């Protein structure tokens, strides 16, 4: 007993989407449902590494303040919508991609100059809509490697970086029991993620990050 | 599942839903029939309410 | 003890008669959480007497409402006491303050 | 005079203290009152009624 | 009463706040912004909504 | 004897048997209501806050 | 990817009971994440060592009294519950105690051993108050973790204990409060390296140099289920 605390097994992957899953553990010792649920939360939401769009250069603009015509939604929205694009960068710190399109209709991330060195993991992401017989737009999009979520605090247009792929993570603890006690915790972790990584593996990455800290103490 | 309103959409008198749910649950518990809905080892209480969801019960049966 | 009170505890706990109160002044001769016994001083003794006031404390006993009522000493052997000092706490008291 | 006593202790005279939640160690927003109330168990305890 | 206290507190606007005035693509990154402590809950913002 | 099986049986008996809770006095119909029970270690009846 | 990993660079046993320990450096957030995880683990899950039964020569139940002693037997049990000791490689041990003659009775009176070590000799068990008075008793100690109330314990023993034993509630967990704090420190000519300080109050049976590693171990193995998924 004295050093053989109860260990969970995954009760389910409980998967409802490729984007979101409800990985549940049972039993955990009393109170550990927070001690791990939140600990992995704080890892997952803020200290997972990854790659994201970081800066934009649409043709001839000094500030997204300038609502250049030919596009339906103004540049403040194109700027955030380009933050919406999930991307994978292989082996590099920062990479610039180019995008252009022409003709009346939408623009999509599928229209980017796909290097193959970089994967746009969701091509069908609409970027904007075009609004004249002569409508075409061309831009450089910078993608960068980094960690967590970094706000707009630091012709280029700066934007917040979504390096962590976790769109949301949440967790609960709840009653679970065995044949003789009910003071034990279940843990439900729910998370939703941008498609760069599947969640039942993102958590295995995160559990590793946390485990690596302990490696200098564990006997 | 618990709220029976979708069964009341089908038995438009709410009293008849108790008389019909009881009758059908008795055909299961007592009359020895088994459900046309997939049972999940629910009580006949719930199975009979889940038999209204399949849209295949009224007091003709 | 309540940390914030009104100074009425020093009276309710004594006048309610449930703390055992020193009938005459003297010095504690013996204590054992069942008995407390006081060598009364000759300035308050009656002349033919042995001169020794025992107090057999009531220990665990049912109250009329089934809560227990064990009195406990507050004195130490050889300690002096003066008439009307609390010798033993009641239920819900300590050092003679009310303490619910 | 309460403030004066709390100043004689080394305590915060606002009476309030910032607290953290032991489920995460996050801080609570704005301080909260902390101090030594007196509380009585009443004779209506539950196993005598269940 | 406590539920409505919480919802009142959650939905006020405080004219000074941490992270005030930025523009977000949805509630989920609103929550990431709150939970990481980057924006205060009653801070003013613009969001895309659906 | 309260043997180790009985709870796994109980948590099958009860598994969805509504139980009726009412205070007294009970002025109006909303004063008796039914709830599905879930088991508890203590001795109090855990009621739902809004109700 | 730039993660600096911690080492437990320093410790200060400020008292025979209280100590500080520091883990350094840490990245963003990890000062908080470990800072709270280890506090919560240290409070729940450090194993320790408690009194668990007491047999006193002439007593029959908790509520009695012994001639010539200053405490009801019950307040002796409330005193021994707080007594704390190390035991060396044992799941349990029995301590004999004997005293006679007027005055205090203190843990220093227990029949000492090499394999038991007491954190505070002056912790007091009762007073004797008569010239011929005595107590002799056999305090049984057990190892364990968390808290186990005697009411559930005897319901877990399932044989009927003899008349004239007393039972005490078990409170093994040896740490009474834990605090954590995070701050920046000089390393590599750079900022936002957290020196985590954890500082702790204990019953005195354990030293942080074990405790923080044991807590980290518990965490590290509980966490296996989330990488083994």
Is some CB atom of chain A closer than 8 A to the CB atom of G222?
yes
Instruction: Please work out, in degrees rounded to the nearest 5, the angle formed at the alpha carbon of residue A134 by the alpha carbons of A130 and A140.
Output: 60
Q: Which chain A residue shows the shortest CA-CA distance from G5?
A: A213
Structural domains of chain A, with CATH: 2-49+164-219 (3.30.1360.10), 50-163 (2.170.120.12)
**Segment (H or E) for G209:** helix G208-222
**Nearest chain C Cα distance for residue G218, angstroms:** 41
Asked whether the bond before G39 is cis by omega within 30 degrees of 0, the reply is no
Radius of gyration of chain E (CA): 11
Provide, as residue numbers in chain D, all residues whose Cβ is less than 8 Å from the Cβ of G35: 25
Tell me, rounded to whole angstroms, the distance of Cα E47 from its chain centroid: 10
Q: Which residues face G127 on adjacent strands? A: G104
Phi-psi label, residue A33: left if phi above 0, alpha if psi -120 to 50, beta otherwise: alpha
How far is G111 from A112, CA to CA, in rounded Å?
Answer: 83
**Three-state DSSP class for A34?**
helix
CA distances from A52 to D8, G53, G149 (A): 56, 63, 54
**Contact list, A34 vs chain D (CB under 8 Å):** 23-24
Phi first, then psi: give them for residue G140, nearest 5 degrees.
Answer: -100, 130
Instruction: Return d(Cα G160, Cα A206) in angstroms, integer.
Output: 51
Q: Which residues of G69-79 are buried (b: 16+ CB within 10 A; e: fewer)?
A: bbbbbbbbbeb
Sequence-distant contacts of D38-42: CB under 8 A, at least 24 apart: D38/C2, D38/C3, D38/C4, D38/C100, D40/C100
**How many CB pairs lie under 8 A apart between chains A and G?**
105
Backbone angles phi, psi at G120, to 5 degrees: -145, 100
Ramachandran quadrant class, G203 (left: phi over 0; alpha: psi -120 to 50; beta: rest): alpha
For C25, the domain range is 18-92
Q: Which CATH number characterizes residue C66's domain?
A: 2.40.50.100
Tell me the structure's resolution in angstroms, rounded to a single decimal. Answer: 3.0
As a whole number of angstroms, the distance between CA F27 and CA A94 comes to: 71
Q: How far is B46 from chain F (nearest CA, A)?
A: 8
Say whether A149 and E19 touch across the interface (CB within 8 A): no
Question: Is there a contact between G186 and G21 (Cβ–Cβ < 8 Å)?
Answer: no
For A152, the closest of E22, E28, E32 (CB atoms) is E22
Q: Which residues pair with A100 in a beta bridge?
A: A138
Chain D positions touching F44 (Cβ under 8 A) are 46, 50
**Which positions 19-58 of A are in contact with G (Cβ < 8 Å)?**
23, 25, 28-32, 34-36, 39-40, 42-43, 46-47, 49
- The CA distance from E44 to E25, in Å, is 15
For residues A140, A150, G190, G179, the Cα torsion angle rounded to the nearest 10 degrees is -170
**Chain F contact present for B4, CB below 8 A:** no
CA C84/CA C67 separation, integer angstroms: 27
Burial class (CB in 10 A: 0-12, 13-18, 19+), D46: exposed
Pick from A162, A210, A218, A194: which is nearest to A36 by CA?
A: A210
Q: Where are the domains of chain B?
A: 1-61
* Cβ neighbours of A110 (radius 10 Å): 15
Helix (H) or strand (E) holding A147: strand A136-147
Residues C31, C73 contacting (CB under 8 angstroms) = yes
Q: How far apart are CA A124 and CA A122, in angstroms?
A: 6
Q: Beta A94-102 vs G170-171: how paired, if at all?
A: unpaired
C-alpha distances out from residue D48 to A67, A190, D42, F29, Å: 75, 42, 12, 30
Cβ contact A183–F41 (<8 Å): yes
Cβ proximity of B3 and B48 under 8 Å: no
Per DSSP, D28 falls in state P
SS3 for B50? helix
Half-sphere exposure of G31 (CA within 13 A, CB side): 18
Distance CA G57, CA G51 (A): 17
Q: Which residue, A57, A120, A152, is CA-closest to E25?
A: A152
User: What one-character DSSP code corresponds to residue A40?
Assistant: H
Compute chain C's Rg from CA coordinates.
14
- Chain C environment of G69 (Cβ under 8 Å): 32-33
Nearest to G136 by CA among G76, G204, G184: G76
- Interface contact A46, partner E, CB < 8 A: yes
β partners of residue A71: A130
Selected residue of F41, F43, F45, F46 to mutate for chain D interface (largest D Cβ count, 10 A): F43
Rg (CA), chain B: 10
Per 3-state DSSP, chain D is made up of helix, strand and coil in percentages (nearest 5) of 20, 10, 70
Which residues of chain F have a Cβ shorter than 8 Å from any chain B Cβ?
Answer: 15-17, 36
Cβ neighbours of A42 in D, within 8 Å: 24
Three-state SS for A187? strand
| Residue D21 C-alpha, separation from nearest chain G C-alpha, in angstroms | 10
Asked whether the CA dihedral G150, G156, G160, G161 is positive or negative, the reply is: negative
Chain C CA closest to residue D39: C100
| Nearest Cα residue to A9 out of G222, G37, F7 | G222
Question: What's the rounded Cα separation, in Å, for the pair C94 and C92?
Answer: 7
Task: Spell out the alpha helix ranges (H) of chain C.
Answer: 9-15
CATH class of segment(s) B1-61 = alpha beta
Torsion-angle region of A148 (φ positive above 0: left; ψ -120 to 50: alpha; else: beta): left
Buried residues in B10-22 as b, exposed as e (16+ CB within 10 A) = bbeeeeebeebbe
Nearest CA in chain A to F2: A180
Distance from CA of F3 to the nearest CA of A (A): 10
Beta strands in G58-211 (DSSP E): 85-87, 92-100, 103-106, 116-118, 124-128, 134-145, 147-148, 165-167, 170-171, 175-184, 194-202
Sign of CA dihedral G83, G86, G91, G94: negative
Q: Hey, what's the torsion of the CAs at G180, G186, G189, G191, to 10 degrees?
A: 30
């Amino acid at each position: 007993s004295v050093t053989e605390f109860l260990k969970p097994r995954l009760v389910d992957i409980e998967q409802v989407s490729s984007t979101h899953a409800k990985v549940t553990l049972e039993p955990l010792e009393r109170g550990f449902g927070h001690t791990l649920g939140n600990a992995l939360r704080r890892i997952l939401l803020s200290s997972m590494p990854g790659c994201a769009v970081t800066e934009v250069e649409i043709d001839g603009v000094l500030h997204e303040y300038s609502t250049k015509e030919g596009v339906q939604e103004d540049i403040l929205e194109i700027l955030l919508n380009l933050k919406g694009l999930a991307v994978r960068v292989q082996g590099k710190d920062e990479v610039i991609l180019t995008l252009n399109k022409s003709g009346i209709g939408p623009v999509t991330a599928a229209d980017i100059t796909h290097d193959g060195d970089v994967e746009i993991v969701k091509p069908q992401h609409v970027i904007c809509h075009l609004t004249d017989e002569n409508a075409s737009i061309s831009m450089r999009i910078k993608v960068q490697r980094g960690r967590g979520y970094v706000p707009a605090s630091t012709g280029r247009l700066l934007v917040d970086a979504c390096y962590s792929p976790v769109e949301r993570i949440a967790y609960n603890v709840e009653a679970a029991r065995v044949e003789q006690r009910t003071d034990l915790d279940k843990l439900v972790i729910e998370m939703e993620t941008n498609g760069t990584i599947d969640p039942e593996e993102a958590i295995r990455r995160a559990a590793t990050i946390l485990a690596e800290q302990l490696e200098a103490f564990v006997d | 599942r618990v709220t029976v309103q979708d069964a009341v959409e089908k038995i438009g008198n709410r009293f008849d839903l108790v008389l019909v749910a009881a009758r059908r649950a008795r055909q299961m518990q007592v009359g020895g029939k088994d459900p046309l809905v997939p049972e999940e080892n629910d009580k006949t209480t719930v199975i009979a309410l889940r038999e209204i969801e399949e849209g295949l019960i009224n007091n003709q049966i | 003890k309540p940390l914030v009170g009104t100074g009425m505890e020093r009276a309710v706990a004594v006048d309610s008669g449930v703390t055992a109160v020193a009938k005459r002044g003297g010095v504690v001769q013996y204590v054992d959480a069942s008995r407390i016994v006081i060598k009364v001083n000759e300035d308050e003794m009656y002349p033919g007497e042995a001169g020794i006031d025992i107090y057999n404390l009531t220990k665990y006993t049912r109250s009329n409402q089934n809560t227990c009522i064990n009195q406990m000493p507050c004195v130490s052997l050889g300690e002096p006491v003066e008439r009307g000092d609390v010798l033993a706490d009641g239920p819900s008291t300590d050092l003679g303050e009310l303490a619910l | 005079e309460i403030k004066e006593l709390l100043k004689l202790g080394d305590l915060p005279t606002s009476g309030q203290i910032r607290l953290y939640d032991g489920r995460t160690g996050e801080q609570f927003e704005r301080p909260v009152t902390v101090g030594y109330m007196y509380m009585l168990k009443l004779n209506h305890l539950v196993d005598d009624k269940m | 009463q406590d539920v409505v206290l919480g919802l009142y507190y959650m939905t006020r606007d405080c004219v000074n706040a941490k992270g005030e005035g930025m523009v977000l693509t949805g509630p989920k990154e609103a929550e990431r912004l709150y939970r990481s402590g980057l924006a205060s809950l009653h801070a003013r913002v613009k969001v895309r909504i659906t | 004897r309260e043997e180790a099986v009985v709870w796994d049986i109980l948590d099958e008996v009860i598994r969805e048997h509504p139980v009726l809770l009412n205070r007294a006095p009970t002025l109006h119909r909303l004063g008796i209501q039914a709830f599905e029970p879930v088991l508890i270690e203590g001795k109090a009846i855990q009621l739902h806050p809004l109700v």
